[PDB]
From a paper:
The D-alanyl carrier protein ligase DltA, as a remote homolog of acyl-(coenzyme A) (CoA) synthetase, cycles through two active conformations for the catalysis of adenylation and subsequent thiolation of D-alanine (D-Ala). In the first adenylation reaction, D-alanine is converted into DltA-bound D-alanine adenylate (D-Ala-AMP). In the subsequent thiolation reaction, the activated alanyl group in the intermediate is transferred to the thiol group of DltC-linked 4’-phosphopantetheine (DltC-SH). D-alanylation brings in positively charged amino-groups and partially neutralizes the net negative charges of the phosphate groups on the lipoteichoic acid backbone.
We also determined the structure of BcDltA in the absence of any substrate. The crystal structure of DltA in the absence of any substrate was observed to have a noticeably more disordered pocket for ATP which would explain why DltA has relatively low affinity for ATP in the absence of any D-alanyl carrier. The longest such disordered region is between Arg-397 and Glu-413, which contains the inter-domain hinge residue Asp-399, interacts with β-phosphate of ATP, and forms the pantetheine channel. Asp-399, equivalent to Asp-398 in BsDltA, serves as the hinge residue for domain rotation. The more disordered nature of the substrate-free conformation of BcDltA also implies that the previously observed adenylation and thiolation conformations are intrinsically unstable unless stabilized by the interaction with one or more substrates. This structural feature of BcDltA likely explains the relatively low sub-millimolar affinity for ATP, since part of the stabilizing BcDltA-ATP interactions would be used to compensate the cost of establishing the adenylation conformation of the protein.
Numbering used by the authors: 1 to 152, 160 to 362, 368 to 396, 414 to 432, 441 to 501
Write the structure that this text describes.
Amino acid sequence: AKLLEQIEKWAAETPDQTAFVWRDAKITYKQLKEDSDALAHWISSEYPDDRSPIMVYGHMQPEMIINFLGCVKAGHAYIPVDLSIPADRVQRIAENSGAKLLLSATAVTVTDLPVRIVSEDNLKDIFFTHKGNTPNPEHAVKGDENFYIIYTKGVQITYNCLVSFTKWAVEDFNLQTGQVFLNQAPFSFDLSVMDIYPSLVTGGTLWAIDKDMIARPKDLFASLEQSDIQVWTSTPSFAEMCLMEASFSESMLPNMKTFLFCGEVLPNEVARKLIERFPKATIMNTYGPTEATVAVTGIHVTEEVLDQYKSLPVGYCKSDCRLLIMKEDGTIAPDGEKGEIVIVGPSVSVGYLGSKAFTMIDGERAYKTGDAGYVENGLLFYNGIEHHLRACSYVEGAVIVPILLAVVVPGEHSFEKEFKLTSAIKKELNERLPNYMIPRKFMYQSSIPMTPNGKVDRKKLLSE
């Protein structure tokens, strides 16, 4: 049925089941339906014909999801804005997007925004004032109408784009029903969509972790231990950070069944370690730009895949879409050859809000990713040494950053001086790589730093 119908179905079938939980704050499918219905009814009464996007500001409060649903149920696309987004950027969105309203799941800090701000208590008053009211079914966003706009430039993701992505994920990733889904990515990062919607349409439970938790491993693991998470969606880096914890394995999350990765490169070793620690789980690696609705390719990372590849492939393209590897010139690269990845089909966004990259191919929307890659027998390899670096002795983790800078988290070793560990690693690397490919500069860290979205913090590494 409809995306929204698929969700409300659970409000009827399992009304008391938790739809979302953040620390002590929880909301059941019934509460989600009531409050989002209340919000939507209010939005419609306040804005009779306006259908401008609506900003939803906060971090991990349940009201984030409630607001998302209220906006779309009233025919307005929501624009998620996490607290970690820089104030001037938030302001630029306030002017760029054309939004006239902002709903807050906390205390709005970014002062003076050219938009009507509906704070936390003002938000509670509307859930109360419109309690029991339901929105006009015809107001719900549909077809090629915007559902959400996530900034990267505001990427317009339609109802049809989301549906195309959500059905593929639930079906191909073999998600059940009633499973607990981890949410690590802030909502301002579309990776979050890979868990939010497949969970809501399958009656799962979203277990959100937050910034403060991540900054305190004891807190993070305490939460994970009680989560009973079954479907883990995060960036490779966040999982790698969790793997540094020796107790992060099956015994901690006995019911883990599906790891879903996207956002950056998933190291072969990381995937191998996950497999060793969670023998009952299936690991899925995926790829896609924000402009193609979260992800378009996917592949089950098996022992086989780990063995025949060094850098892991990013998968097979969902069939209602297609990938084209383009050499410099509208000429398609022969299979196996490198070129720019181009995506075409229903997952492709309708374009940047306002305002090169979007085009039309064979009558369908297409997007030039600006990403290099190549395909072999339908298998996509994404290309933006690290694999060989990670495999070296004394290296427990590493990332290569082109300025080439090798950043490595050293494991136990016996070297008294840094330059001696560096020479040893280089000597080892020279065994599998020509000398000119070995990074000149090496830097050591206790751990690879991540941005608030969970990706490798390149900027920070360069600054250091």
